[PDB]
Each structure stands twice: as C-alpha cells, then as structure tokens.
C-alpha cells in the first residue's frame, strides 16, 4: 500500500563552500592584483538567494576564519557577500601557514552536524596555491568529502602555484586536456568552470511514498439497512490518503 505522485526536480538548491587561501605564500601583490578581483568576479556570478545558492565562506591561514555562515544575509545576497571581499581587500594581509585541511574539515563539520540543506548540492570551491601545511592530510579530507557526494572545484591563486597538487586534489587525470575541476586563469575561466556545477536543470519524475497499513474498518453507521463506515490511518507522507469511506449493509430493516 503506497502512493505515487508527480513532482519537478531542478536541483536549484546549492550549498557553496568557498574556502580561500589567505596564507603567507599567496603574496601581497598577488592578493591585491589577482585574488581580490578573482573573488569579486566569482561571487558576482553567483545568484545567491534563500531558495537557491547559499554561500559559506572561510579564510584559511595559520587559523581558519569563518567569514560567512550558510543562510545569513551575506550568504543569500550577492551584494552583501561582495562587501566582505571589499572588507578583505582593505583590512587583510595574507600571512602565516596554510590550514587547508582544517578549512575542508569545516565543510565536513557542516555535513556531520546536518547544518547543510539535505536536498542541496554540496559544492566546495577551494581557492589556493596548492601548498598546504600537509599534502597527505589535505588530500585525505578532500577524498572523504568526495565519498560523501560533495563536489570539489579548485581555483589556482597566488604567486607560486603548485599545479601538480591542485590537479591531484581536484581529481584531474593525466594526459587529459582541460580538466573540468581545476582552473588557474582569470575570473572568467573560474566562472565558466563553476557553471556546470550549479546549473538548474528541471525534470519531471514520479515518486513513491509508503502510507502504511490502515486501521480496522469501523462498524456500520446503521445496524440495519444500507449505511456507511470508514477506516483511518496516520499520515506518513503529505500525499498519503488518511481517510476512506465505503458503503455497507447490515441486512434489511424490518
Ligand atoms: C441496531 O440494531 C438493529 C437490529 C435495529 O434495531 C436498528 O434500528 C433501526 O435503525 C434504523 C436506521 O439505522 C432506523 O431507520 C429504524 O427505524 C430503526 O429500527 C439499531 O440501530
Ligand atoms: Cl593542511
Ligand atoms: Mg600557503
């Protein structure tokens, strides 16, 4: 005993975790002339809203710093997110070590705590020169994320980019032209790289829900002649029928 229904699946919800390398290897001139415009062009291409893309943003250096939480004003309003980038241009100087594993671990923590939206595509954008505090540890956590169906895109930034590491953590194959998971040019190429990951595509599918067993049919409304009775059941799903009335006859009336 189940119920079938039609619905549209568009995958419009995306939790996008932007992890930004703010470590000392990035280089200040690179930060100003390349990273900031990268962030502006990238975030400007993201049509954030309550119902679709929600941005999370972390800056990782010696420590990790959570800049934007999923669901807040700055998470769902592109203009507010761009203000954060401006704040970083004016007040942040890249310095220190590179807590890439800890930053990826913040994504893990979202999944573990069930803070993400269950129906949302989980998308990590890792923006880095690819020189983490520990290569093995960063690969390990990235691989754990992938095994939980999290998509990972890598954007190369910084004065001295380790493309080999970036390509490895992104999952790029050797002898393969134009990896779909790694980009290291300008914001235009980054935007184009991200697009297929977040595209809304609507299909119409059928769905099945289990409504469970019915309660016993009640006694007939009349003890003689033609009457009615009913059976009920708790709603285990929105589109499950909960009540049901049929006719009955307890003989004839004298
Ligand atoms: C249940 O027991 C039966 C043997 C009858 O005595 C039923 O009574 C009758 O109820 C019907 C309507 O259901 C009336 O139209 C009759 O006038 C009445 O005798 C009793 O409810
Ligand atoms: Cl690390
Ligand atoms: Mg570094």
Binding residues for Mg(2+): 23, 25, 98
Atom 17 (ligand 1) nearest CA:
253
- Give yes or no for residue 219 CB within 6 A of ligand 1: no
Q: How remote is the CA of residue 223 from the centroid of ligand 1, in Å? A: 6
Compute φ and ψ for 239, nearest 5 degrees: -90, 20
Q: How remote is the CA of residue 220 from the centroid of ligand 1, in Å? A: 11
Q: How remote is the CA of residue 219 from the centroid of ligand 1, in Å? A: 14
Q: How remote is the CA of residue 122 from the centroid of ligand 1, in Å? A: 65
Q: How far is CA 69 from CA 9, 56, 66, 110, in A?
A: 26, 5, 7, 10
Q: Which ligand is nearest to the CA of 131?
A: 3
- Give yes or no for residue 254 CB within 6 A of ligand 1: no
What element of type H or E holds 81? helix 78-91
Cβ distance 76 to 108 under 8 Å? no
Q: How remote is the CA of residue 26 from the centroid of ligand 3, in Å? A: 6
State the structure-solving technique. X-ray
Q: Which ligand is nearest to the CA of 127?
A: 3
Residue 87 token pair: 């704040």
Residue 252 CA to residue 28 CA, distance in Å, equals: 95
Q: How far is CA 233 from CA 5, 107, 215, 248, in A?
A: 19, 41, 6, 20
CB within 8 A of 33, min separation 6: which ones?
none
Q: What are the chain's domains?
A: 1-10+200-254 (2.20.100.10), 11-199 (3.40.50.410)
**Which residue among 219, 220, 223 has the greatest number of ligand 1 atoms within 8 angstroms of its CB, and so is best to mutate?**
223
CB within 8 A of 199, min separation 6: which ones?
none
Compute φ and ψ for 207, nearest 5 degrees: -130, 150
Residue 123 CA to residue 170 CA, distance in Å, equals: 12
- Give yes or no for residue 228 CB within 6 A of ligand 1: no
> 53-60 and 64-68 as β-strands: parallel, antiparallel, unpaired?
antiparallel
């Amino acid at each position: 005993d189940e119920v079938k229904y039609s619905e549209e699946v568009c995958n419009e919800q995306v939790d996008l975790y932007l992890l930004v390398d703010g470590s000392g290897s990035i280089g200040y001139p690179n930060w100003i002339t390349k990273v900031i415009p990268m962030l502006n062009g990238l975030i400007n291409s993201l049509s954030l809203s309550r119902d679709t893309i929600n941005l999370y943003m972390n800056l990782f250096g010696s420590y990790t710093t959570e800049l934007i939480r999923l669901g807040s004003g700055q998470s769902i309003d592109k203009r507010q997110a761009l203000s954060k980038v401006t704040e970083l241009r004016k007040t942040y100087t890249p310095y220190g070590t590179t807590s890439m594993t800890a930053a990826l671990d913040e994504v893990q923590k979202h999944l573990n705590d069930r803070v993400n939206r269950e129906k949302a595509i989980q998308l990590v954008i890792l923006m880095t020169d690819g020189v983490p505090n520990s290569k093995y540890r960063a690969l390990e956590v990235a691989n754990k994320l992938k095994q939980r169906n999290v998509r990972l895109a890598v954007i190369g930034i910084g004065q001295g980019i380790n493309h080999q590491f970036n390509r490895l953590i992104a999952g790029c194959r050797p002898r393969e032209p134009n990896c779909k998971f790694y980009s290291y040019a300008d914001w235009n190429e980054a935007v184009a790289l991200i697009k297929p990951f977040i595209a809304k595509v609507c299909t119409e599918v059928e769905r099945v829900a289990n409504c469970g067993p019915w309660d016993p049919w009640t006694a007939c409304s009349v003890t003689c002649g033609r009457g009615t009775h009913s059976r009920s059941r708790p709603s285990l799903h929105e589109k499950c029928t909960t009540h049901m009335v049929s006719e009955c006859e307890e003989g004839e009336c004298p």
